[PDB]
Interleukin-17A (Homo sapiens), 201 residues
Amino acid sequence: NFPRTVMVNLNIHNSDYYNRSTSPWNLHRNEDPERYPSVIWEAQCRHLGCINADGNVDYHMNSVPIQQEILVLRREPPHSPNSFRLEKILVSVGCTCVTP
Amino acid sequence: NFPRTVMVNLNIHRSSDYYNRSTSPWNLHRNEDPERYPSVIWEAQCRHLGCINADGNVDYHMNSVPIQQEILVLRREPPHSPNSFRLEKILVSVGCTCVTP
Ligand SMILES: CC1(C)SCCN[C@H]1C(=O)NCc1cccc(C(=O)N[C@H](C(=O)Nc2ccccc2)C2CCCCC2)c1
């Protein structure tokens, strides 16, 4: 497992819209100073069931979050403002309605 | 503005088949790009225009839309460089949800 060190220039140079969803969700920020990005919003489902056409909640269905695996930069060594090792974390990118 | 170069150790220590019971199911599509890390990117593609109800049929009174999110990749700068990158912001479909038109 030889380390593949790489230079990266951090200078980039380039849920409320899905509120009509049957399985709506909110955004919860995740702060971690020893990580890039430091702030990660995570999708928290608003209901246990799914909202039907009428408007009320149907609990025969389940509003589950969509958990995906992405990469984040972990400070190696700790508290290093210029040295990172990328790590594989699990986050919720949204919600979807599923059947039992 | 002023460039912000940092050191990144690239040595680390079916996502659509999981949510097949979704009312707004989707598949994964390959997006290949040599000058980008990671190279392969799987984007979610909704399998139906409408959503699936309790009867298993497709209700077109509802719409299954792709959940688009802004993520980061690593663009090669200079081009074809195997050790130097500048991260860019790209837009991908991380899944599908069922909405009401
Ligand atoms: C795209 C999907 C997950 S969607 C579901 C189906 N296909 C997946 C897929 O194909 N994954 C592979 C892939 C493709 C492209 C990029 C990433 C990636 O891990 N980008 C990182 C990132 O941006 N993380 C982040 C942290 C907190 C807030 C927002 C974003 C950055 C990487 C470079 C260093 C810095 C971090 C991964």
